[PDB]
Amino acid sequence: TLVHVASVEKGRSYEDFQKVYNAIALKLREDDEYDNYIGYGPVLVRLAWHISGTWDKHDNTGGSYGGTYRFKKEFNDPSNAGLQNGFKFLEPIHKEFPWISSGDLFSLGGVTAVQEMQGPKIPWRCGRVDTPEDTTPDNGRLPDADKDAGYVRTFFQRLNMNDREVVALMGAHALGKTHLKNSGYEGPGGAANNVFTNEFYLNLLNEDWKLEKNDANNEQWDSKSGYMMLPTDYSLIQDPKYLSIVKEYANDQDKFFKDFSKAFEKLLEDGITFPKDAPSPFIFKTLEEQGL
Ligand code: HEM
Numbered sequence: 020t021l022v023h024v025a026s027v028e029k030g031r032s033y034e035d036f037q038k039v040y041n042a043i044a045l046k047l048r049e050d051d052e053y054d055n056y057i058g059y060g061p062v063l064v065r066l067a068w069h070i071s072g073t074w075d076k077h078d079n080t081g082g083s084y085g086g087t088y089r090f091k092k093e094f095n096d097p098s099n100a101g102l103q104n105g106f107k108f109l110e111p112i113h114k115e116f117p118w119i120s121s122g123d124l125f126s127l128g129g130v131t132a133v134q135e136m137q138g139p140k141i142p143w144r145c146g147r148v149d150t151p152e153d154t155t156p157d158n159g160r161l162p163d164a165d166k167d168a169g170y171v172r173t174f175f176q177r178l179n180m181n182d183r184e185v186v187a188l189m190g191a192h193a194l195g196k197t198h199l200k201n202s203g204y205e206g207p208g209g210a211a212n213n214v215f216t217n218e219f220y221l222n223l224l225n226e227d228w229k230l231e232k233n234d235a236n237n238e239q240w241d242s243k244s245g246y247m248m249l250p251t252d253y254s255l256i257q258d259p260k261y262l263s264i265v266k267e268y269a270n271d272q273d274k275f276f277k278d279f280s281k282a283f284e285k286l287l288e289d290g291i292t293f294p295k296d297a298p299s300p301f302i303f304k305t306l307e308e309q310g311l
């Protein structure tokens with residue numbers, strides 16, 4: 020398999036990355052109108068996941084390391100429709116801090132978004148290094164939404180995620196919304212879609228879901244409250260193993276936060292070899308903690 024060794028941007032340390040975090044966090048606060056006042060947090064979380072979710076454990080292709088989303092093949096992946104909004108948000112940040120690698124910037128955008136939306140602290144490591152256009156993974160490595168629990172389980176084995184990690188990661192679907200023009204699905208998953216909570220699990224268990232067709236002729240699960248779940252989301256309450264874990268997170272906010280933090284860091288670091296003398300993971304302070 021390919022080896023990708025983390026290489027710290029020359030001379031940089033925690034303070035440098037905290038400044039980048041702060042610039043992203045301040046722009047998140049500033050650009051509040053986006054997507055009918057949802058703001059950019061959810062799309063930045065999705066971007067960090069999609070740049071990581073191309074990874075294949077079998078040969079170490081894809082993954083966040085190479086920053087390959089910047090290349091046309093990947094940014095034009097139909098699975099990535101709408102993420103251009105996140106990329107455009109990050110452009111002025113990259114211009115201000117041209118020394119940060121693209122993979123570091125995209126992954127840090129996700130960490131910053133989660134924390135600024137009052138989610139768990141996500142430790143983050145620097146050292147992703149931009150790789151050439153020919154290292155861009157082909158389209159088709161990101162998951163389909165119209166599938167069942169068996170599909171989800173098998174899909175995530177490629178990313179070395181187990182049942183607990185899958186169910187934890189999926190809690191991010193509390194955030195933002197599906198947009199018909201991007202993915203052929205429409206609607207939010209709950210009421211608090213720019214604040215990071217365990218609402219995804221509570222809504223799965225507590226809403227009265229009806230299997231309906233949307234205006235793109237795709238099936239999705241809809242509630243009277245105006246929420247929606249993808250078939251792959253709903254599969255987490257159809258499969259008995261996933262259901263137990265859904266119930267656990269619906270009943271323990273802290274446990275969900277801790278497990279999401281671990282799985283999300285792991286997702287963002289898949290494929291990267293960290294030297295034994297690499298810096299420890301950074302835990303950034305939020306703007307609120309800094310009084311900014
Ligand atoms: C079976 C796995 C998954 C499937 C099939 C899936 C599918 C989707 C789809 C179809 C959308 C709507 C995109 C749009 O129309 O704009 C979406 C949105 C989103 N996804 Fe996932 N997803 C999966 C896993 C994940 C994971 C693991 C995360 C992160 C931990 C994540 C984070 C998000 C976020 C934050 C949004 C909202 C984006 C926005 O509001 O712009 N998803 N997902």
Ligand SMILES: Cn1cncc1C=O
Pocket residue numbers: 191192193194195196197206207208209247248249252
């Ligand atoms: C609302 N939703 C349901 N599944 C995914 C999403 C995006 O947030």
